[PDB]
Amino acid sequence: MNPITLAIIYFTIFLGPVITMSSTNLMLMWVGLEFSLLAIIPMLINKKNPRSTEAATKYFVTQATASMIILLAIVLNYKQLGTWMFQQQTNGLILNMTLMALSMKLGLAPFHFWLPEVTQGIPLHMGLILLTWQKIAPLSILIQIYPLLNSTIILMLAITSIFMGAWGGLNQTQMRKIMAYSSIAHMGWMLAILPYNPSLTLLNLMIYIILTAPMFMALMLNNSMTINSISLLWNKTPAMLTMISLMLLSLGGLPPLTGFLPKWIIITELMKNNCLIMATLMAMMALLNLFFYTRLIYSTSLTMFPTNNNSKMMTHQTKTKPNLMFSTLAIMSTMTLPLAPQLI
Template identity: 80%
Template sequence: MNPITILIIYFSIFMGPMITMVSSNMMLTWVGLEMSLLAITPLLTNKKNPRSIEAATKYFITQATASMMLLFAITLNYKQLGTWTFQQETNNILLNITLISLSMKLGLAPFHYWLPEVTQGISLPTGLILLTWQKIAPISIMFQIYHLMNPTVILTLATMSIFMGAWGGLNQTQARKIMAYSSISHMGWMLAILPYNPNLTLTNLLIYIILTIPMFMILLTNNSTTINSISLMWNKTPAMLMITTALLLSLGGLPPLTGFLPKWAIITELLKNNCTIMTTLMAMMALLNLFFYTRLIYSTSLTMFPTNNNSKMLPYQENNKHNLMLSTLVNLGTLTLPLAPQLVI
């Protein structure tokens, strides 16, 4: 692809969510979402194969449908109130349509079916953008209008997402699909606390991004896309096994790692608001998430797949791939639990 074209694409991907975050005008937030959608579509089809074309088609149709619903709600709200912002007088049906459209963009259940398939069909760098940066704009819109939305609908979508993210990842062998279902589950946790403490939603999003980026960096370093290929890291980069184990356990929310912080804070906040049953179900589903992360660790670290003798010399060969940010992000993703009081306040 032409370097100038790549520069324009990445600039548009960066500016789309930025415009959405800083805008109070709902039409401008919609423009930011559209910029992000149109810019990432060429990256989805960068690999010229049927799977990437199928993934790009699914992504475009889903996101275009969500954008159409959001524009429909914004236009009707302007017709009724004469303003481009949502107010207390905004019709509840329009707010629910907005919530559904944003849920489709985030991949929340029951609108999540496109996310694992699209993530599986695209390259690892584009998958990283899809599961991290592309989540920021819809969550920023929810952060602005959460006080107007129906808490019951929000909690229903959150609970369904946590369940689907936990159950869907159990039988997966593809690393990208596992990360996609992990994203669905984490988005459910973020949405669950939104009506009560939106600052915790942003904290959870930040920690999720810090954990996801180094995980994709490790997959990129070893060109690993399946559990079997990840299991060969003991031949190529043995030190990566310990890092991968720590990151996966942190993603699962195991104390005393960083990933435990948002789950602990969210559960505490929900219990303060008398959501006992929902909190119990969320904690049970967190154990399912931890189970398939642990199974991935077992397959990669505690088993040794048969390989030829030549591959045992791979650790002594020079590795030309260097990730300068990997060590910093791994430390942030595993050792920042002592900063919990400052992050939660």
């Protein structure tokens, strides 16, 4: 990429979420969403492999129709209130549209089909951006409008996502898609507490970002899109085997690690609000997510899969190092739990 183009695109992919967050005029929030859609598509097809064009053409159609639905909500509001922004008075259907639409861009629940497929055809790098710096934008729009959205729908999309994400993940063996599925799940918890305590959504996101960003830079350190590929981690780079183990169990909710806090406080907030029906079912299938996380643990760490002689060759050569971010985001993530009170 002519480095100039790289700058323009990257600026847009970054001006995209930032305009959304900063503005209050919904319109300006919509174009922030629009710029993110335009900026991400070029990077998605960088290899320009036949799989890639498929990825982008799906991502784009799914993103575009949702963008149009979000605009329709703003256009309708404009006629039910002269304001260009959702208010207490807003017709309920107007808000529900925004939930469905925004739940498509974020890819939650019954609209979770595009994400796993686009996460499969894009590079590991652009995978991260597509999973974590593109969720900030829509979520911002929701978090702003939380007082007004429906508790019922969110919960249904929340629970569905948790289930779909978990069930989908169990079968998958491609890593990119295992992560895509996890993101659907975590995204679910996040949207469950939005109606009740938005501030916790912003924790269940950061922690997801501080967990997923190290996890993916791990997958690419050896650029392994297969579990079999990550399983030979012990030969290619032995040290990351320890933290890859804890980060994945952290992604699932197991108690000593940082990953428990988001689930724990979301459950505490939902029980405070009396959803002890919903919270219970979510926590239970949340346990399904750890099963596929630990199955990967087995292959990568607890058991040593057989490797190839040609690997001895890759050991010889100095391994290009993992950026510092890996460490700082691996530790702050695997073990901050002793510092939970200040996080929330």
